[PDB]
């Protein structure tokens, strides 16, 4: 009746041709206009198998996001093996917009609607769509921001939970705001993120309880990342064109799982390691004024130590294909022709 198959998917967006914001500039020319009445058809009585970990939709979104970043970011200096590239580095307008992934003729996208679907296995409530939901291509580590939520319980996704090297995606069912500010005026690189600790620790506590169901009720303990690059030992993200790096030691507080505002210390860095591929880039010092991003934390990226009565987890991230997975897990492409 249909065949699993891969094809070249295109993107669609509500990008504006008059916007100087870089995602708009990219998407107006990478992606078609969104269709104003998207049809979704329930496949009555169908059970279908899915696998979020072998889904070429993720690879294609990855290529587009790299394309977007390669066009849009203007580092003063780009260092890659045998190459120092120098150019002008004016400040840009930067704020992610959603994009949708869509099939050409002959293919359709199947969507798993089982609320507690973990990403692999049979799905009992399947529909066909022309395009995904709108996904913001937000590039971050540790916390997944401005994404979709799980509809019922908190979900744990891993390619293989027993393999301590495989990243665990936690999909939250209630978001918690994180508010990051480099205030106006004066260590210009000093910033911070505020999180309501009551709301956060309640959610973290539910996360701990859910992980307990997968690890035979053992004590769940969080520890800071064990080492590596700053982009992944910190919660890193781009806020208005600036590269923020936020220390998350206090976010993952085992005593709390308090009450008050949690304040994470952040720094805006100019010399960064590039997520798109090998090498480093240098940017200009931060723009003047109040730099602020208020984001919804909708997911968490973790690794488990593995290798007694406890399991130890540490904030993860860096493989930006895990970011796309957290939103594409419910979709797969099939061939009808």
């Amino acid at each position: 009746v249909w065949k699993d198959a891969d094809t070249t998917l295109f993107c669609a967006s509500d990008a504006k041709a008059h916007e100087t914001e870089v995602h708009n500039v990219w998407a107006t020319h990478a992606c078609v206009p969104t269709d104003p009445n998207p049809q979704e058809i329930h496949l009555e009585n169908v059970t279908e198998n899915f696998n979020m970990w072998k889904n070429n939709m993720v690879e294609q979104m990855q290529e587009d996001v790299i394309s977007l970043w390669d066009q849009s970011l203007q580092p003063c200096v780009k260092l890659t093996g045998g190459s120092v590239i120098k150019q002008a580095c004016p400040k840009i307008s930067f704020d992610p917009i959603p994009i949708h992934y869509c099939t050409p003729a002959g293919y359709v996208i199947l969507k798993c609607n089982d609320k507690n679907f973990n990403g692999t296995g049979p799905c009992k409530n399947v529909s066909s769509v022309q395009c995904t939901h709108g996904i913001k291509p937000v590039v971050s580590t540790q916390l997944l921001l401005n994404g979709s939520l799980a509809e019922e319980e908190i979900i744990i996704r891993s390619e293989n939970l027993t393999n301590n090297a495989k990243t665990i995606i936690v999909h939250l069912n209630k978001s918690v705001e994180i508010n990051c500010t480099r205030p106006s005026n004066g260590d210009i690189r000093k910033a911070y993120c505020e999180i309501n600790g009551t709301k956060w620790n309640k959610v973290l506590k539910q996360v701990t309880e859910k992980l307990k169901e997968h690890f035979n009720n053992k004590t769940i303990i969080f520890q800071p990342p064990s080492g590596g690059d700053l982009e992944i030992t910190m919660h890193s993200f781009n806020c208005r064109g600036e590269f923020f790096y936020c220390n998350t030691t206090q976010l993952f507080n085992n005593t709390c799982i308090c009450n008050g505002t949690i304040t994470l210390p952040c720094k805006i860095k100019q010399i960064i390691n590039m997520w798109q591929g090998t090498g480093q880039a240098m940017y200009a010092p931060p723009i003047d004024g109040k730099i602020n991003c208020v984001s919804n934390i909708t997911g968490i990226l973790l690794t488990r130590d593995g290798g007694t009565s406890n399991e130890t987890f540490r904030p993860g991230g860096g493989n930006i294909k895990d970011n796309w997975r957290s939103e594409l897990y419910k979709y797969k492409v099939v061939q009808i022709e």
């Epitope: 107006t28 990478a30 078609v32 206009p33 104003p36 587009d64």
Partner: antibody, heavy 119, light 111 residues
Framework: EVQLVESGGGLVQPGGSLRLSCAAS????????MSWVRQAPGKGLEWVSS????????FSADSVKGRFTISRDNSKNTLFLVMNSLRAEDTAVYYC????????????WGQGTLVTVSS | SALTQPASVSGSPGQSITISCTGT?????????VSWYQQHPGKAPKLMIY???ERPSGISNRFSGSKSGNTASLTISGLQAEDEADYYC???????????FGGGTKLTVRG
């Protein structure tokens, strides 16, 4: 200012092939969607194909599906149209066009290249 | 043609004339991506109006575009001799048909 110059047209037998090239200058080629639009002698405009900025995605008219392929080389500022299995009804001036947006209208058009399919 | 335009329209200098372009609810009716092009003999098309009613820089404000339902319209006020040319409408049409054009309108300026 934008310039677009088409080459590679000419005379070709029915069933034959051609490759059209468009040389782009005056703008940052790699950031724009591009299209080919044709016009048979004495007749109206017909969209043929379009390509997004990176070239990862292409779109073609049903009348040319499976015969024509659009592509681009962003390192060389060139747009191509590979055309196979040509027929008389493909005879036309083929214009290269720079697009306002993918799927949108084309704010700059080359002078076109005539393609004549005949023995 | 997928969009329908009158084959011919005429006017006198200084008159206002309007060229219709009728499509369907999956093209003109679904988006605001209608463009109009002017084509003089032997020359490439020139964009006059895009996104229904926007004008590129350097195009006379005598040219304006509008839409109602599945019908777009190009209006040319204070008609001049040099407006005598062929005019084509065009729309996005969804992700498979993509872009559709009208059959064209030959505009003549009498006097």
């Amino acid at each position: 200012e934008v310039q677009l110059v088409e080459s590679g047209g000419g005379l070709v037998q029915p069933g034959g092939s051609l490759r059209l090239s468009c040389a782009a200058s005056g703008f940052t080629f790699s950031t724009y969607a591009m299209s080919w639009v044709r016009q048979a002698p004495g007749k109206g405009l017909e969209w043929v194909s379009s390509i997004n900025n990176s070239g990862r995605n292409t779109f073609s008219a049903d009348s040319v599906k499976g015969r024509f392929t659009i592509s681009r080389d962003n390192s060389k500022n060139t747009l191509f149209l590979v055309m196979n299995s040509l027929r008389a009804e493909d005879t036309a001036v083929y214009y290269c066009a720079k697009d306002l947006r993918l799927g949108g209208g084309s704010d700059y058009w080359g002078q076109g290249t005539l393609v004549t399919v005949s023995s | 043609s997928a969009l329908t335009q009158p084959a011919s329209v005429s006017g006198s200098p200084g008159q206002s004339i309007t060229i219709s372009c009728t499509g369907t609810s999956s093209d003109v009716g679904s988006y605001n991506f209608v463009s109009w092009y002017q084509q003089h003999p032997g020359k490439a098309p020139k964009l006059m109006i895009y996104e229904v009613s926007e004008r590129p820089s350097g195009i006379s404000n005598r040219f304006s575009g509008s839409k109602s339902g599945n019908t777009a319209s190009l209006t040319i006020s204070g008609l001049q001799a040099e407006d005598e040319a062929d005019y084509y409408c065009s729309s996005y049409a969804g992700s498979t048909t993509f872009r559709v054009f009208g059959g064209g309108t030959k505009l003549t300026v009498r006097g």
